[PDB]
Design a protein around this nucleic acid. Structure first.
Ligand SMILES: [Mg+2]
Ligand SMILES: [Mg+2]
Ligand SMILES: [Mg+2]
Ligand SMILES: [Mg+2]
Ligand SMILES: [Mg+2]
Ligand SMILES: [Mg+2]
Ligand SMILES: [Mg+2]
Ligand SMILES: [Mg+2]
Ligand SMILES: [Mg+2]
Ligand SMILES: [Mg+2]
Ligand SMILES: [Mg+2]
Ligand SMILES: [Mg+2]
Ligand SMILES: [Mg+2]
Ligand SMILES: [Mg+2]
Ligand SMILES: [Mg+2]
Ligand SMILES: [Mg+2]
Ligand SMILES: [Mg+2]
Ligand SMILES: [Mg+2]
Ligand SMILES: [Mg+2]
Ligand SMILES: [Mg+2]
Ligand SMILES: [Mg+2]
Ligand SMILES: [Mg+2]
Ligand SMILES: [Mg+2]
Ligand SMILES: [Mg+2]
Ligand SMILES: [Mg+2]
Ligand SMILES: [Mg+2]
Ligand SMILES: [Mg+2]
Ligand SMILES: [Mg+2]
Ligand SMILES: [Mg+2]
Ligand SMILES: [Mg+2]
Ligand SMILES: [Mg+2]
Ligand SMILES: [Mg+2]
Ligand SMILES: [Mg+2]
Ligand SMILES: [Mg+2]
Ligand SMILES: [Mg+2]
Ligand SMILES: [Mg+2]
Ligand SMILES: [Mg+2]
Ligand SMILES: [Mg+2]
Ligand SMILES: [Mg+2]
Ligand SMILES: [Mg+2]
Ligand SMILES: [Mg+2]
Ligand SMILES: [Mg+2]
Ligand SMILES: [Mg+2]
Ligand SMILES: [Mg+2]
Ligand SMILES: [Mg+2]
Ligand SMILES: [Mg+2]
Ligand SMILES: [Mg+2]
Ligand SMILES: [Mg+2]
Ligand SMILES: [Mg+2]
Ligand SMILES: [Mg+2]
Ligand SMILES: [Mg+2]
Ligand SMILES: [Mg+2]
Ligand SMILES: [Mg+2]
Ligand SMILES: [Mg+2]
Ligand SMILES: [Mg+2]
Ligand SMILES: [Mg+2]
Ligand SMILES: [Mg+2]
Ligand SMILES: [Mg+2]
Ligand SMILES: [Mg+2]
Ligand SMILES: [Mg+2]
Ligand SMILES: [Mg+2]
Lengths: 59, 386, 136, 78
RNA sequence: GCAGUCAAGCGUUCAUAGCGACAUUGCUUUUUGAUUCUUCGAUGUCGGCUCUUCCUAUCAUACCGAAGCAGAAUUCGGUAAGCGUUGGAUUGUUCACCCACUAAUAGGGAACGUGAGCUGGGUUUAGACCGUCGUGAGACAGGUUAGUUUUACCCUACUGAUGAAUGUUACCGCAAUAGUAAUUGAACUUAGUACGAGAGGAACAGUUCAUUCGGAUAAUUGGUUUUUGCGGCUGUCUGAUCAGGCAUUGCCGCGAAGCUACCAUCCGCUGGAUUAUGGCUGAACGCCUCUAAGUCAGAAUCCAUGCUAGAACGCGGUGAUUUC
RNA sequence: GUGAACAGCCUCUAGUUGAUAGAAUAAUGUAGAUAAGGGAAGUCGGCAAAAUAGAUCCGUAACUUCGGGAUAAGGAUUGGC
């Protein structure tokens, strides 16, 4: 279930230190941070779900 | 006295003597059983070991910690361009053993096989098989009865085929001739299949199929004269010992007062024949097929031939066998592959394997790139180039 | 191996001959494990009984809790360093050679296991599965 | 059948190839070969080694057209 | 040292399930003794290392029969030597005795197997210390320490290697005879089933691995480096530069190709006839009986199947067969 | 010249280039070497081999006939410009 995070590269998972205003973390306290796991921004078959957005309508 | 600590002997007396073999072409000492009821076809094939490579495939061993998982296995690859039938032989039961009763050869004969019947080709007048080529002139007549003789008697029948060596990147020229048992119905039906194929051609896909258990037969690589230690797996004598340590200390006991047959000695290591059983075919590839190397999963267009070629061999342009694992004899050697002599219910055999990926990366180093495609795609462009 | 390990160990290159000494990976007081034999291993004059991942060996303690000293107990090899290979095609090696003292029933004596652990081993002993963190 | 890359050099590692190393901190390291692996054990640093991807990105070598303009924008309104 | 016979006893009862007195008859030649036939114009004894073969009075493994065999376990026996019989602490030791694994860690022969095969630790020359003895030189089957292990080119045996003569020469073949090889264990499942009051507690089929052994092979991984192949380094010498020389391969990292490793991967076949033993039919002996005639089933055995040679005085088929 | 140095290694002067050859590169050797993981399990016994090594600086035990032990041990640093 871990989410992707734009621009982390790496087809693997890693454990980043996150903050306010940043993907995959909503804080719990004024100036709190948590170090959490994240899946990369490079698609693999490890992925349960891709999330995609249309920009040109085909035929 | 008796030993002190019993421990098992070295070597295997079943492989004696350990002499150089009497020909590079190990001998099909035996042939599959015959059930004359299936269609008639060949029971072996002639080849040239090109080398080995690696394969990735899933596994189907319902039980094992690697069931339905990927594994990577080594595979050799023998160069196997369609053999050509040029003669036929019928044998007979005789209270002394089997006995060749006649051969019957085709009319025209490739200089490839004619080559074989010689030692100083270029000089000779190449008269081989010209008075024989006659006997067709007259209607047939003689050739007729000969075939006809075979049918009346002949308890078994073998084909005289020969490798089309010219299609093999070898430098050899002199092609390889050999007998091959025929295991299809009725001796009479057999010789017909024989006759009908003279001058003409037989291909591997008509002898062998994917996932089928085959046996290899070839003469082992050679290593010349050998110390007792390596030739027999003998313990090194300890360091302190005068006059050498790659020996045997007690070459024999007093009585019986002779060095015996059962005790190891220094001799010729290698260049033995071996019959090697139970190898499975992982691919029966066609030469009129670009992307042999490809797979249902891989898809990229590539022949099996690794970058910069097979080390020490050539480039594999024809049809081939690919066998799970390793094969007696070395690269560029004439190899026989043979239908097995019993049907195996091995589960480990019958497993219907399916390749996922075939290593195309050069074996002249630590290769990274399968295709020059893949290469140019990764490094970018260089000081030559566009 | 053997008794109390459910599962089956595919062969991996031995790398721990008798007399080798390996880091103790748990917290029993034991600091090192010195190997004196290897259950299962067999006979061939002058071969040394060697052990690999998830093997069980009789061992002693050279450095550690004076109560764990001067006697012999079973133990379980969990880290290698002698590059073995799995069926998946890869050759891999740990940084040390490491074990965790255990009872015959394959049970730990330790609270947990410091450091990473071979999966070949995890699958073998359920209680090493427990106390392990990072596996392979 | 994942293909991997080299923690040192950074070149693709087809299956079976190279060597894997499991460090103390439980960090992993794949090498395509003995070559990298040695340097790695030598404590050499990738960006000082000329033929390495890590090195190459840091020094901007022949990236040319990856910093070249693409075209992917549309019109919506609804 | 090993094995019998008689059967008083032991064995709750009960002679012989397992044992067995008093007597008695034997085998063995890894004990020791007795002898002194052979070796004194001589050539080391101990032990180990290594390597082969053989024996069976069989520890384990295959198939059996018996039990004071409910299961599990274990004992007694039969066919059996096909196969295996390990790793260490102290000791020069054999022996001994512990630690530990193991399926089991059986016992013996081969000039008390094996020194131009090794080692030389003990013993057993010369040096030396101590104890005991002796006036003394010296002595000790007492403790100590130090102390040169020579020759193969010959014959034969063994391993491998050529090879004249049976017209020449070439290709393809058969198979006499010889050798022959595989092994042992665990886990899952059977199944907490059979049996048992309970505690406990199996096995045949099936599957997944594993040990010891063997024969290959180098895709991969590792080792190796005179590829002196590429880069680096010291010292000096070529005026400097460029590029190189020397340092018994000067040194260092990488290093292809080969060679190579349970340090790497691959492969190791299935039929028949038997043994013991349990049986069928069945007389002898109107009954009974596996046996006398005849017959069934059966083992890590045996003969094949397979595999390795291929008789250079065993051989078949086939091609071409010379003119100055 | 390097360097503590009549050491090793290279060179000037002078002196040599003498020691049967040629082709190969099997086993077994002699002499020179490296080897994964383990680390005396080898062996009568660490036999052999390997590890150490210069210099500057920090640091230095028992015991002692106070002279020692002692480079004890244990450590850092070292080119070039
Ligand atoms: Mg014995
Ligand atoms: Mg005829
Ligand atoms: Mg060529
Ligand atoms: Mg081998
Ligand atoms: Mg030996
Ligand atoms: Mg000596
Ligand atoms: Mg290569
Ligand atoms: Mg030994
Ligand atoms: Mg202490
Ligand atoms: Mg965990
Ligand atoms: Mg390498
Ligand atoms: Mg640029
Ligand atoms: Mg009774
Ligand atoms: Mg009584
Ligand atoms: Mg006498
Ligand atoms: Mg009773
Ligand atoms: Mg009972
Ligand atoms: Mg019996
Ligand atoms: Mg020993
Ligand atoms: Mg000892
Ligand atoms: Mg004695
Ligand atoms: Mg005792
Ligand atoms: Mg005797
Ligand atoms: Mg003797
Ligand atoms: Mg002798
Ligand atoms: Mg001697
Ligand atoms: Mg002596
Ligand atoms: Mg003396
Ligand atoms: Mg004393
Ligand atoms: Mg002495
Ligand atoms: Mg001396
Ligand atoms: Mg000699
Ligand atoms: Mg001879
Ligand atoms: Mg002749
Ligand atoms: Mg259960
Ligand atoms: Mg009861
Ligand atoms: Mg290599
Ligand atoms: Mg250089
Ligand atoms: Mg310089
Ligand atoms: Mg000079
Ligand atoms: Mg000199
Ligand atoms: Mg080779
Ligand atoms: Mg293996
Ligand atoms: Mg083997
Ligand atoms: Mg067969
Ligand atoms: Mg076979
Ligand atoms: Mg038969
Ligand atoms: Mg009978
Ligand atoms: Mg009868
Ligand atoms: Mg009778
Ligand atoms: Mg004869
Ligand atoms: Mg002959
Ligand atoms: Mg004959
Ligand atoms: Mg003839
Ligand atoms: Mg001379
Ligand atoms: Mg030559
Ligand atoms: Mg010892
Ligand atoms: Mg020494
Ligand atoms: Mg070193
Ligand atoms: Mg120091
Ligand atoms: Mg400085």
């Amino acid at each position: 279930g871990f989410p992707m995070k734009q621009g982390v590269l790496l087809p693997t998972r890693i454990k980043l230190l996150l903050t306010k205003n940043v993907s995959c973390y909503r804080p719990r306290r004024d100036g709190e941070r948590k170090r959490k796991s994240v899946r990369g921004a490079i698609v693999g078959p490890d992925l349960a779900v891709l999330a995609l957005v249309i920009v040109k309508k085909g035929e | 006295s008796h030993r002190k600590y019993e421990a098992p002997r070295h070597g295997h007396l079943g492989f004696l003597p350990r002499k150089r073999a009497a020909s590079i072409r190990a001998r099909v000492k035996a042939f599959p059983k015959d059930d004359r009821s299936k269609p008639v076809a060949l029971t072996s094939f002639l080849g040239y070991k090109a080398g080995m490579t690696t394969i990735v495939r899933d596994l189907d061993r319902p039980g094992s910690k690697f069931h339905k998982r990927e594994v990577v296995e080594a595979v050799t690859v023998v160069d196997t361009p369609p053999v050509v039938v040029v003669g036929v032989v019928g044998y007979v039961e005789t209270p002394r053993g089997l006995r060749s009763l006649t051969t019957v050869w085709a009319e025209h004969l490739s200089d490839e096989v004619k080559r074989r019947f010689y030692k100083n080709w270029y000089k000779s007048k190449k008269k081989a098989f010209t008075k024989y080529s006659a006997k067709y002139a007259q209607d047939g007549a003689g050739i007729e009865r000969e075939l006809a003789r075979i049918k009346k008697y002949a308890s078994v029948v073998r084909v005289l085929v020969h490798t089309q060596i010219r299609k093999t990147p070898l430098a050899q020229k002199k092609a390889h001739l050999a007998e091959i048992q025929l295991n299809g119905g009725s001796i009479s039906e057999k010789v017909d299949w024989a006759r009908e194929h003279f001058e003409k051609t037989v291909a591997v896909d008509s002898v062998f199929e994917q996932n089928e258990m085959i046996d290899a037969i070839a003469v082992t690589k050679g290593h010349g004269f050998e110390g007792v230690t390596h030739r027999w797996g003998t313990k090194k004598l300890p360091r302190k010992t005068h006059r050498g340590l790659r020996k045997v200390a007690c070459i024999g006991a007093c009585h019986p007062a002779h060095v015996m047959w059962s005790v190891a000695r220094a001799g010729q290591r290698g260049y033995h024949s071996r019959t090697s059983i139970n190898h499975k075919i992982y691919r029966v590839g066609k030469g009129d097929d670009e992307a042999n190397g490809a797979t249902s999963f891989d898809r990229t267009k590539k022949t099996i031939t690794p970058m910069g070629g097979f080390v020490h061999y050539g480039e594999i342009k024809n049809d081939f066998i690919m066998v799970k694992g390793c094969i007696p004899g070395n690269r560029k050697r004439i190899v026989t592959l043979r239908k097995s002599l019993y049907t195996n219910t091995s589960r480990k055999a019958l497993e219907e394997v399916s390749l996922k990926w075939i290593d195309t990366a050069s074996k002249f180093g630590k290769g990274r790139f399968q295709t020059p495609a893949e290469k140019h795609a990764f490094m970018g462009t260089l000081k030559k180039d566009l | 191996s053997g008794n109390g390990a459910q599962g089956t160990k595919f062969r991996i290159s031995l790398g721990l001959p008798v007399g080798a000494i390996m880091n103790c990976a748990d917290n029993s007081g034991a600091r090192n494990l010195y190997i004196i034999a290897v259950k299962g291993s067999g006979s061939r004059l002058n071969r040394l009984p060697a052990a690999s991942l998830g093997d069980m060996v009789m061992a002693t303690v050279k450095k550690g809790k004076p109560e764990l000293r001067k006697k012999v107990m079973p133990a379980i090899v969990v880290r290698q360093a002698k590059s073995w290979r799995r069926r998946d095609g890869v050759f891999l090696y740990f940084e040390d050679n490491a074990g965790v003292i255990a009872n015959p029933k394959g049970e730990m004596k330790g609270s947990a296991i410091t450091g990473p652990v071979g999966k070949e081993c995890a699958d073998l002993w359920p209680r090493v599965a427990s106390n392990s963190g990072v596996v392979v | 059948m994942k293909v991997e890359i080299d923690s040192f050099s950074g070149a693709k590692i087809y299956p079976g190839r190279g060597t894997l190393f499991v460090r103390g901190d439980s960090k992993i390291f794949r090498f395509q070969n003995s070559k990298s692996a040695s340097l790695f054990k030598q404590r050499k640093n990738p960006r000082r080694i000329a033929w390495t991807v890590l090195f190459r990105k840091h020094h901007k070598k022949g990236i040319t057209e990856e910093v070249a303009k693409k075209r992917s924008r549309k019109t919506v309104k609804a």
